[PDB]
Amino acid sequence: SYLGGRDQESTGFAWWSGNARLINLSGKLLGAHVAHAGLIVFWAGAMTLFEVSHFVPEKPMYEQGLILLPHLATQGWGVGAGGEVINTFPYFVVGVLHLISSAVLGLGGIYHAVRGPEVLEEYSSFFGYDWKDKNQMTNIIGYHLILLGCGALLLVFKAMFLGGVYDTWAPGGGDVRIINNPTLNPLVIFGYLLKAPFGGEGWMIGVDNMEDIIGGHIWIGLICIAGGVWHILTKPFGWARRAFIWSGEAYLSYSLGALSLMAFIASAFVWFNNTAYPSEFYGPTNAEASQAQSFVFLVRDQKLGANIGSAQGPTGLGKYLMRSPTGEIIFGGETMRFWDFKGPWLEPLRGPNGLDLNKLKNDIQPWQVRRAAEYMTHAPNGSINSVGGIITEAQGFNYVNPRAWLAASHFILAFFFLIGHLWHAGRARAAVAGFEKGIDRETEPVLAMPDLD
Amino acid sequence: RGWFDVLDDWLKRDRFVFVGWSGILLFPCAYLSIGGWLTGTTFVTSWYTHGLASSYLEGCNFLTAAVSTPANSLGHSLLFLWGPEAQWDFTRWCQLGGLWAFVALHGAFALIGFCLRQLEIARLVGIRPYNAIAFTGPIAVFVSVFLMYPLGQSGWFFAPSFGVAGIFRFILFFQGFHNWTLNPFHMMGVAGILGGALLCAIHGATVENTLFEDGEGSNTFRAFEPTQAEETYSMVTANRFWSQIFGIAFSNKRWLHFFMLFVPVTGLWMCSIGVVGLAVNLRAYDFVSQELRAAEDPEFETFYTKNILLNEGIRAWMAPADQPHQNFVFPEEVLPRGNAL
Amino acid sequence: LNIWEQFCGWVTSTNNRLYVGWFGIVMIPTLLTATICFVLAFVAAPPVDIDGIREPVSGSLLYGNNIITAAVVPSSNAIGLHFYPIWEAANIDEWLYNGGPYQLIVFHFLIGIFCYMGREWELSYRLGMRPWIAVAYSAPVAAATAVLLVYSIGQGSFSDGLPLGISGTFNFMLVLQAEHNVLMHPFHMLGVAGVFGGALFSAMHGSLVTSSLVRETTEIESQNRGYRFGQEEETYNIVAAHGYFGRLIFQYASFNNSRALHFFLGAWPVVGIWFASLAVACFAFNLNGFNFNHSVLDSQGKVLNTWADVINRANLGIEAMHERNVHNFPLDLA
């Protein structure tokens, strides 16, 4: 009787809201995502295939303004020692293996959207899925979570078996080292989650000593697997059946929350962390460069013959080495805010209390300052187009510091996804309550309620 | 008919753009000063007025392109193309000013022609105008910033320059040389515009939150024959919504719309009478208090005396470069520098 | 009936003067602590040292300053991004000298401004309305995210980032132009056109109803009176208002149906300001509006003055004068 198709007047949806003809169509929704996952994979190779051939290996990696090649060099596809790049051929083959893998992911999203069946469900009793047969909808999350945790164990078999992951805490700058003991002990790694989200402590962001990262994806792989075979074998519970809406959009409005939740935290891994994202490949953070500005002017005035300590500043406070509120001797000036800085350089200046003046004189080597002199000129400070440094400085060098140039571009997207989560939760709660199209003419629910005053 | 009624039967026809018997002042004077402005961004320039390169021909990419001003040593003379200064020459005219004179004047003369226009269609459909009453917001901004601000001060170089960044200079002019923030006549205007921006946002929400859904479809934009006497939003559920959440609620559907007229129009009118105080620079940058123990007392430490030294950061830094009329040149240790920066 | 359903069934009930329901359970305590602390910090808070050296800057009405000049005067540079509650202070005099009551009216206020955004949803489910007003309130709750929390995270300390007060709001803007250049930035310039359009579209649609209103009274009384609240007949004819604003501009320039018009009043200011609030969220990570300084130049190579360097000669002067003690080093990249 029906079988109208895709018009304005069979489904009640217009040319905009241009998917909601595929809420109930099971088969063509699969052709939506496979054409979309073919499109994410298409960008994932062709950006790196554009990043290589706009690459120069002699110039440092953050200089040319590229954001995927520092993701590859954290896993260590051919980085020698100290952040020099020895081989660019593993960077080339990883994108062509994404460029060719988009075409076979592109055939699915055009077969399942055009030629393939419209009634995905009605088939061999496998896919079908009535956003309301709960036992079936948990099996979809169970099929993904045994594959999500198996991609979680693909990092540790990269780190513990094939070569090794890059490590900025290596002696001699930074180097790939094959990690031989990740941490299993949950009182420090699940103890990351029970920490303060503020400065100092740093809840999920300050995650130094790289063998706790590889301890993460052992512990995130062995929970997503054990969560994956939970949702195959059982059903949702009794309280979950009456607490969680249970329909199409909303059953898809929960991914806009924990997501917008994900790229809030990913807009802080790329902004504060110095061990999951190395500064030799991404560039320095805001905390690193402001310590580095104070550090190169210290060792200049140390080499210019001037007792560091005894120097009061312009203000009464110490110009170089004052003390933080809790006793660790830190760098002076405006760098009291980044007193929690724990980069790889100046960790050989950390004493028991902090920046210790037995070793702050007579243990600055010429490698240490020329790294911090590099991060001082390469601070996260840019224009829209290219121009780095402060804005009252003229345009000379062009550099956007792709820590900062990536942190905002997820925060545009992490804010926007909290909107449409909240916007889809409105149409969610009005899906099962039947007033998605507005109030009734005759049975108005306000008139049953009494007067306020 | 007569001689004049045949003309009045012409301009009040149902042509697709309505030409208007008041439109003969508009349509010359509004194609000029749009298209007078659009040559001043591209072709004619500054650098003979106050030493700036502000055209597409010199190559600035529209976020610093503007038809500027006349010079400061030139007074308040309406550079007239055929005027004393003009000497009937296109060049130099624009190079020494013009435009901005031309565009400013013609724009001012139109805005009359548009507010005459919406009065004129309001009688033809018989509609009781308030758009012309609500255009007194926009016309009192233009004649009191681009017209009556420079005529209190020196000549039209200190008038704002027509561009996006030429306005942005005139912004940071009014921060430093006048403190146009924190005088109270500007601060009602921020209550006017931001209060106006809520009342169209919050009224745009609730008509899309209380609907009848007469149609059997899904799209909410359908089922609304314009010739429909029954009202499409509730106002009984919307009053019940806002009496609970905010505690106060519009308990009748008129004066919900009169308040949306009133809240940005009286915002601009209070903002319009502030810059006429700035025209004779009755600035109210200074407080009569809070300064004598900024002089006697270094222990008295407040945001306002922090803010008043920031305006000294304007007035001795950009003023040699903003106004090369006086040739102000500064020897680099007379400028207020705070520290190492 | 049940003891807990007598609660869960009082709090979610509609017949109350304000809705206390489940988002209000976080809101009503944790916003009203920020109300009580705001009136007391405005009046008698001891000065707090914004600059992070020593200098206790006063913003309370007992210490000689006006209501324009008063502030909550935000927390110190020395604490940084530390959680500094009232109990990790050794004394409350140590709290209030070193940035105490600012963070009490930030973390309480930002919780209380988000649960309002949930509470505006919650009654629209508890009535028959279609719930799309939490997304409309997601625009000035984002402005509360940016300059209170989000910009103060990425810049460093909790020192920078107040609006708290009146002159301290104007001091915060003039440094955000000075430090990292609000003005020539395409999210803020898109954002003010939403507000300026939202200035006009308030005064446009609000005029055009008050224009095209039907006759139901006489001249001597008010014309706001003759109908009753809750009537079903539309007080102004929409066909007359459409062919007047149509007659003004052209015929297809005006919305033939009013239900599409009210989406556009709830689009143009609300899409605008969360671009402007994603200017400051983009400005948190020092991704600033672009510099056209020294752009045009002679074939000699001599510099040519633009408006942009004239903005910069104003912008460098606020940068060379702000925070007049704390800079010991030639760049302000902290």
């Binding site: 007067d451 306020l452 005053d453 | 009984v236 009053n239 009496s243 505690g247 106060i248 308990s251 009748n252 208090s289 | 003067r17 009046v43 009405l61 007992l62 006006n66 209501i67 009753r228 609240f229 809750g230 009537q231």
Partner: peptide
């Protein structure tokens, strides 16, 4: 003197913020 002049007009504005919430007239439908 001036310090009580601000606190007077502040809390007299805040008193109407209490009175308009509680003692709003009831709207009646007809």
């Amino acid at each position: 003197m001036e310090s009580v002049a601000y606190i007077l007009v502040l809390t007299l504005a805040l008193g109407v913020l209490f009175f308009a919430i509680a003692f709003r007239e009831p709207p009646r439908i007809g």
